Amino acid sequence: KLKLSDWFNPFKRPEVVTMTKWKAPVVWEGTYNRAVLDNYYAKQKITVGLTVFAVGRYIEHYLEEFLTSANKHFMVGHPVIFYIMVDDVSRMPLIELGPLRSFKVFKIKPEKRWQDISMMRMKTIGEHIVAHIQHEVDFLFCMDVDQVFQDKFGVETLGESVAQLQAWWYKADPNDFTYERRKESAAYIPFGEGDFYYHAAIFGGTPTQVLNITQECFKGILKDKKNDIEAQWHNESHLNKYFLLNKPTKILSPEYCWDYHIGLPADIKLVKMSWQTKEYNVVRNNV
Amino acid sequence: KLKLSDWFNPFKRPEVVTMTKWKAPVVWEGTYNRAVLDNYYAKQKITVGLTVFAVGRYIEHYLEEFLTSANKHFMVGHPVIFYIMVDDVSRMPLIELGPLRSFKVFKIKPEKRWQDISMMRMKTIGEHIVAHIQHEVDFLFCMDVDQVFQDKFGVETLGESVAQLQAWWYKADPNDFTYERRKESAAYIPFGEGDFYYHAAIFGGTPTQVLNITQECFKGILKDKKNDIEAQWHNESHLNKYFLLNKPTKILSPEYCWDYHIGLPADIKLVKMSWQTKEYNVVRNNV
Ligand SMILES: CC(=O)N[C@@H]1[C@@H](O)[C@H](O[C@@H]2O[C@H](CO)[C@H](O)[C@H](O)[C@H]2O)[C@@H](CO)O[C@H]1O
Ligand SMILES: CC(=O)N[C@@H]1[C@@H](O)[C@H](O[C@@H]2O[C@H](CO)[C@H](O)[C@H](O)[C@H]2O)[C@@H](CO)O[C@H]1O
Ligand SMILES: O=c1ccn([C@@H]2O[C@H](COP(=O)(O)OP(=O)(O)O)[C@@H](O)[C@H]2O)c(=O)[nH]1
Ligand SMILES: O=c1ccn([C@@H]2O[C@H](COP(=O)(O)OP(=O)(O)O)[C@@H](O)[C@H]2O)c(=O)[nH]1
Ligand SMILES: [Mn+2]
Ligand SMILES: [Mn+2]
Structure with missing residues (x-):
């Protein structure tokens, strides 16, 4: 049986938060023993899934760069299946995949507002989990397309339910977080509450956990619609409320999703994934 | 450990050849216990590969029908990877795949002559086995594109090296077989020799065996080129020579690759795959 101490050493990064009050690890560069995990998971013969949506001009801007880098960096040494959700398969870029990728x-149907395109992902992911993903993989990650893998993103990131620290807020206090603060929204988090600010651009877990994450978020999204309210950061607002009520068993450091517009401070030792520069004028068709 | 008698009963089909003189089964409808094999192979967590080439007009004519039918019928209930080799990836038709398919x-480069397009597959298959296929699957089939799955083609077909009985010749006397009969060819088989006439449209096995099948065939092809000779039926002449020397551990009946131009006689109880009608005038550009 795999124990935390087998692979995780918090003391290697004493200058950062490495453990939660519910005893979940926060995975920083230096803290993980990947060789130990690679072996353990190889014996279990795991397969890892990755979902990515590209609707509209997100296809031309981001899909190729995402998939090419994912092929190179994501769960290397283990079978991986990429699940690609596009509104127009004719624009799908043509890329060669390496060993153990398929x-x-x-x-998919494109929604009219980008806000709904972004949010409907929660419904769609759930449907695919029930239909097929639960039968295909042991762990799944669900990712935004507007980012690029920069270095190895491996088995150290695997867990039951996995959350990502948003790069701009990891050192901030909870009362500064851009949580949804309107009590009328299902995503509402009161001041005086919250552990971390999680980024909606990466989340994961077992198919069971990811289905629950996505069903609960989508129920909140739909309830808000009935109450004529839309959460400020959409999926992320709902995701943050979810991870407040149901704590993640693993958190990823901002090294796993870093915004270079911040610069590169001392805490960020080796970037695994970086944000693409925002291009809303082009890639989005409504305010 | 799996035994032949666990899944194979020759006495269900007494009117046809069910065993070879080297004690390999000839798989006919009614002889196999798929439920037993499905459970055995699921516990082993096997993955099955399938290679298919479509170069030139073979893409528009055959590829979509091949893949749609393969998705529906090939190794159902087990993870499958379709390996698709095309000269024009923009012409590759995209179909939706079901659970456990990716x-x-x-x-690939289009060869000038259709004869070399066909024969080069041996070299290309071998390269892909070494590069990735050996790491990805437990068993592999290699198939022509100009055919379509008609019913379940499952784990009853798996084995170390698997050969297909050519539909027109299965009852014929070996000295009527269209073996290469010129002693100058590497594919030469003399009169007085031969077990069966195997079809080049389907062959399989473990990646190890398939590599040896394809390397040996390609060496014969290249040797012939140095001697200014081309084997009468190309890959198939060489494949027949190979299986004479290195006997298949499993043979598939003509039910697994049937030509409806023959009609449907009593021996053919359930067709798993049918030949597409020959359209050489349109699909081939030389000789
Ligand atoms: C400190 C600060 O305000 N930094 C902002 C970033 O938060 C902002 O990123 C956006 O953050 C929201 C949640 O607040 C959400 O995660 C968005 O996806 C993300 O883009 C960034 C945008 O370029 O600007 C900084 O000024
Ligand atoms: C008995 C007889 O002559 N049958 C032929 C078939 O052999 C022939 O099929 C072709 O056979 C060659 C090997 O001889 C090779 O396998 C080809 O791939 C295959 O198409 C068929 C052609 O339609 O005609 C029959 O008359
Ligand atoms: O019109 C759209 C809007 C969003 N998305 C998908 O939804 C994700 C989240 O949207 P976005 O990245 O624009 O949100 P942000 O991270 O910028 O806040 C994107 O990465 C895409 O995968 C899309 O495909 N088309
Ligand atoms: O011009 C060609 C010739 C052949 N092939 C591939 O090679 C296989 C063997 O050729 P073919 O089926 O025409 O031989 P046959 O079975 O008719 O004798 C085909 O099924 C295709 O997969 C191809 O893609 N383009
Ligand atoms: Mn994004
Ligand atoms: Mn053919």
């Missing part, structure tokens, strides 16, 4: 593509 | 596509 893919499958689904044509 | 794929990956490779752009």
